[PDB]
Amino acid sequence: AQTRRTIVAAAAAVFDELGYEATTIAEILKRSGVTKGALYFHFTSKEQLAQEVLTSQLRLVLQQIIDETLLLAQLLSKGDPLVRGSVRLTVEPLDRRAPMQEWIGHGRDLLRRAEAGGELLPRLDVDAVARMLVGGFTGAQILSNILTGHADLLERVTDMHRHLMTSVAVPAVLVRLDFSAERSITVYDEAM
Amino acid sequence: ARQERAAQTRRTIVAAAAAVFDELGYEATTIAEILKRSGVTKGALYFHFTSKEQLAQEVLTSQLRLVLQQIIDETLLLAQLLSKGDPLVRGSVRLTVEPDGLDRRAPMQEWIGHGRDLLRRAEAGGELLPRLDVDAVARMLVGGFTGAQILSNILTGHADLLERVTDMHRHLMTSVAVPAVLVRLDFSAERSITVYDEAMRRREAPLPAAGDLEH
C-alpha cells in the first residue's frame, strides 16, 4: 500500500487550511487517518512535511513550459490539495528559499534547452526570464484569488504567460504555440 | 485650522497603522496597538476610522507626457519605497498577500481601476497596440508587480527588487505599447531614483496635531 500518498494529501489540505504555523503533526494524523509510527521513518519534523508539499508537483520546448504552467493553473483551479498547500506555504509571511530556487531552476533548465533549439530571442538572461515566468504565474494567481476566488485563474494565468512569451519567443515560434483550454485540459486529464 | 490639524493626525494614524500591520498582519493587529504606537487618543482614531477593516483598507489604497510613462513611474516608485522599507508600502504589501474577514477585494478593485483608467487615457492618445482588453491589461500589470515583489522577497530579501520589477514591467509593456512609444519610455534606475527622491520629500514622518495626543 502506498499510503505516503495519503499522508501528504492530508498534510497539504491542512497546511492549505491553516498556516504552516497552526498546522500540527497531530492534526495531520487525525486527518490522514494513518498510523502514528508510519509517518516517522517517512518524515522527521513538521518542517519536512512542508518541504515535500512545496516541491512535490514541481516537441517545441516552449510548449512544455506553457503546458507545465497551465497544468499548475488547472490543479490550482480545481482545489488539488497538493498544489493549494504549496501555494499557501509559498506565499504567507521554514525555508521558503530552497523550494523556490528549485522552482526557478526547473524553469532555467527548460529555457536552456529551448535556447539550444534556437527558440528564444537573442540576448535573454535565461535566469531572469525563468524568474518572470514563475512570478507572472504567482502574481496572476494571487489576484485571481482575491478578485474572483480563482474563477478566472485559467484566463488570467494564460494571459500573463501569452503576453510574456511575446518578448521571449522568436516570432516564427511564438505564432505556433498553443495556449488553448482544449490542450491544457488534455494535459491535465493526462497527469491523473 | 481645525481642518489641517485633523488631516495631520490622520496621516499619523495611517502610518502607525501601516507599521503595525506590516509587523503582525491583519487579524493580530489591534487598534490598541496602533494607539499605543501613534500616541493618539481613542477619540481621534474613532473620529477618523469606522473600524480596523477600514483602516486596513486606507493603508491598502494610500498610494493612489506619455501616459504610459506615468504607469512606469508609479510602478518603479512602489518598488523603490518598498525596497527602502517605507512603512506605508510595507503595510499594503503585507495586507495584500496574506490569505480574518477583511475585504481585500474592494481596495484591489481600486488599484486595478487606477491602471484601467490611465490605460483608457493611453489608448485615446494612441499609445496602445489595438484591440486590447484594458481591464485584462491592468490586471497583468498589477499581477506582475505583485508577483515580482513576492519572489524577490523570498529569494533575496528585496535586494534585487527594483531590477525584478523593472524586468517584468519592461516585458509586459513591450506587448502593450506601440513600438514608436516603447522606444520613448524610460525604464532606467536613473529616472526611478529621481522620482523616489522627489517623493521621499512629500512624505516626512507625520507627527500628530497636539490636540489629539494621549495624556
CB contact under 8 A, A92 and B94: no
List, in sequence order, the alpha helices (H) in A56-149.
61-77, 81-91, 97-116, 126-148
Q: At A80, which amino acid appears?
A: D
> Of the candidates A134, A163, A164, which has its C-beta nearest B151's C-beta?
A134
> Of the candidates B96, B98, B140, which has its C-beta nearest A163's C-beta?
B140
Chain B residue numbers touching A139 (CB-CB < 8 A): 142-148, 150
Q: Residue A5, exposed/middle/buried by CB under 10 A (0-12, 13-18, 19+)?
A: exposed
Q: Provide CB contacts within 8 A for B160, sequence distance 6+.
A: B152
B172 and A CB contact within 8 Å: yes
Domain region containing B150: 1-215
Q: Which residue of B has its CA nearest to A125?
A: B167
Total domain count, chain B: 1
Hey, of A131, A175, A177, which one would you mutate to test binding to chain B, going by the most B CBs within 10 A of its CB? A131
Longest CA–CA separation in chain A, Å? 57
Eight-state DSSP code of residue A60: -
Q: Resolution of this entry in Å?
A: 2.6
Q: Which of A15, A7, A137 minimizes the C-alpha distance to A76?
A: A137
Chain B residue numbers touching A90 (CB-CB < 8 A): 154
CB contact under 8 A, B151 and A92: no
> Of the candidates A137, A159, A167, which has its C-beta nearest B174's C-beta?
A167
* CA B115 to each of CA A134, A157, B74, B100, B168: distance values in angstroms, whole numbers, following the listed order: 23, 18, 10, 28, 16
Q: Provide CB contacts within 8 A for B184, sequence distance 6+.
A: B66
* CA A114 to each of CA A25, A67, A108, B141: distance values in angstroms, whole numbers, following the listed order: 42, 14, 10, 26
The whole-angstrom separation of Cα B119 and Cα B135 is 9
Chain A residue numbers touching B172 (CB-CB < 8 A): 163-164
Query: Obtained via which technique?
Result: X-ray
The whole-angstrom separation of Cα A112 and Cα A118 is 10
B154 and A CB contact within 8 Å: yes
Q: Which of A82, A98, A95, A64 minimizes the C-alpha distance to A15?
A: A82
The whole-angstrom separation of Cα A38 and Cα B158 is 40
Cell reading at A89: 506555504
**CA B138 remoteness from chain centre:** 15
Backbone φ, ψ for residue B213 (5° rounding) = -70, 145
Chain A residue numbers touching B167 (CB-CB < 8 A): 128, 131-132
Are residues B161 and B173 in contact, defined by beta-carbon separation less than 8 angstroms?
A: no
Q: Which of A85, A73, A66, A72 minimizes the C-alpha distance to A144?
A: A73
Q: Which of A54, A41, A50 minimizes the C-alpha distance to A11?
A: A50
Chain A residue numbers touching B146 (CB-CB < 8 A): 138-139, 142-143
Reduced to 3 states (helix: H, G, I; strand: E, B; else coil), residue A37 is coil
Backbone φ, ψ for residue A169 (5° rounding) = -90, 140
